[PDB]
């Protein structure tokens with residue numbers, strides 16, 4: 001038996017009171033009236049999740065798999081990675097990261113307190129000295145907000161993470177590796193190197209490079225749970241191809257053996273819940289490991305399937321392939337073979353993949369390409385998504401402060417979209433104005449890494465990522481308009497015409513404030529007025545240090561970039 005998990009029967013327990021019901025305040029109804037459609041996951045559904053993610057994995061590795069791996073190792077051998085100092089690793093820790101079980105917290109780490117630093121040193125020495133003893137981890141149910149899907153509720157996802165002292169050691173050994181290796185190994189196929197605009201450009205340029213394009217997304221069922229001991233050792237063998245300090249080689253070996261491959265699961269109350277033999281969701285290498293393993297299995301599966309001129313785009317477990325169509329009959333056959341190959345490699349599908357011949361209909365990283373027009377009438381492709389989950393989360397954040405402000409990450413990632421501009425920007429600027437909180441930095445997440453961002457810097461941040469056209473887009477596609485309008489009806493959100501009316505008020509209110517607030521009024525809400533102002537490059541935008549923003553994925557990796 002090669003079971004993903006074994007369980008003792010102890011429960012996955014909360015740390016505090018969990019709310020599942022949408023909190024309601026005086027602001028809630030201005031955004032969303034169908035309150036019973038919005039919920040948060042809690043530890044109450046963790047048992048259901050346990051059942052889904054617990055299964056036997058079989059793996060049959062053929063020559064396509066070994067050929068691809070050999071090519072990947074060749075590329076990896078060109079990477080030179082450095083050790084981070086303790087201070088550098090400490091400064092990457094989020095201020096509100098989970099405290100150590102050993103008497104210090106994230107703030108002590110960030111401040112380089114003698115107690116934190118001495119313990120980190122001792123964890124580091126232990127990693128060098130011992131390469132066998134499984135490292136303890138905490139298992140928790142994530143509290144995440146969704147809209148009910150009648151087609152009702154998702155069980156909580158699990159997060160599995162080692163102690164704070166270990167997490168700092170991971171950064172020291174592996175931050176530079178996980179930040180640099182994936183793009184070297186995968187080239188343009190590595191999704192996390194792209195802003196949303198660069199993602200769209202890569203997908204558009206790829207689609208146009210095929211004589212008769214076909215594309216598909218591949219949805220692996222419970223990817224983390226499909227990741228086998230073999231997979232994690234193969235990831236380590238790729239890491240070791242790098243030019244590394246010998247102390248780094250040893251830490252990486254030790255972390256692989258003791259943490260990455262598996263280990264005991266401890267609940268919040270300190271009881272043993274069981275044992276993991278698959279990917280831990282809360283380690284530094286979760287994103288890089290998943291991306292490498294997905295790309296390996298998929299590249300080999302493409303060879304088994306004989307897909308012609310295939311181009312992959314991989315972001316963790318999220319995979320899209322664009323290739324040369326062999327007619328629609330051979331295309332469907334090819335996907336069945338690809339799927340069979342993936343399954344043999346232990347990556348079976350959730351929903352079976354389907355050939356797509358319209359780029360705008362391929363969803364990947366929950367997103368799709370769509371088309372609008374810029375100020376000169378030119379067709380412009382941009383990244384959008386179904387706004388259901390963004391709006392459900394915004395409703396929650398309307399009434400509750402949360403560690404991660406999804407609305408702000410959403411504005412940043414989806415600035416050019418109809419729904420971020422009309423609803424998210426309007427709603428939240430209105431709240432910030434009222435509470436005089438425009439100048440207060442808020443934490444958000446981009447590709448899993450944490451950023452502290454002042455809302456007043458949004459115009460500059462958006463110009464830098466999306467360009468000035470994000471403030472000028474118009475004539476959105478009927479399909480996009482209709483999906484947005486349909487989502488509002490579903491959630492009981494007021495129609496766009498209401499938001500336009502509200503935005504004129506928000507705009508005027510921002511302009512009245514002068515300074516950076518007026519700039520927000522001017523740039524972000526130019527769409528709301530008939531007498532449209534000329535938007536010109538913002539001098540402040542070029543001064544913004546946006547390095548590290550779209551370099552790598554860090555989901556579960558405990559990374560803070562501010």
Ligand SMILES: O=C(O)CCC(=O)Nc1ccc(Br)cn1
Pocket residue numbers: 417418421422473474475476527
């Ligand atoms: O195509 C036009 O100019 C009329 C409809 C249109 O695109 N209006 C619009 C533009 C941007 C935003 Br945001 C909302 N509505």
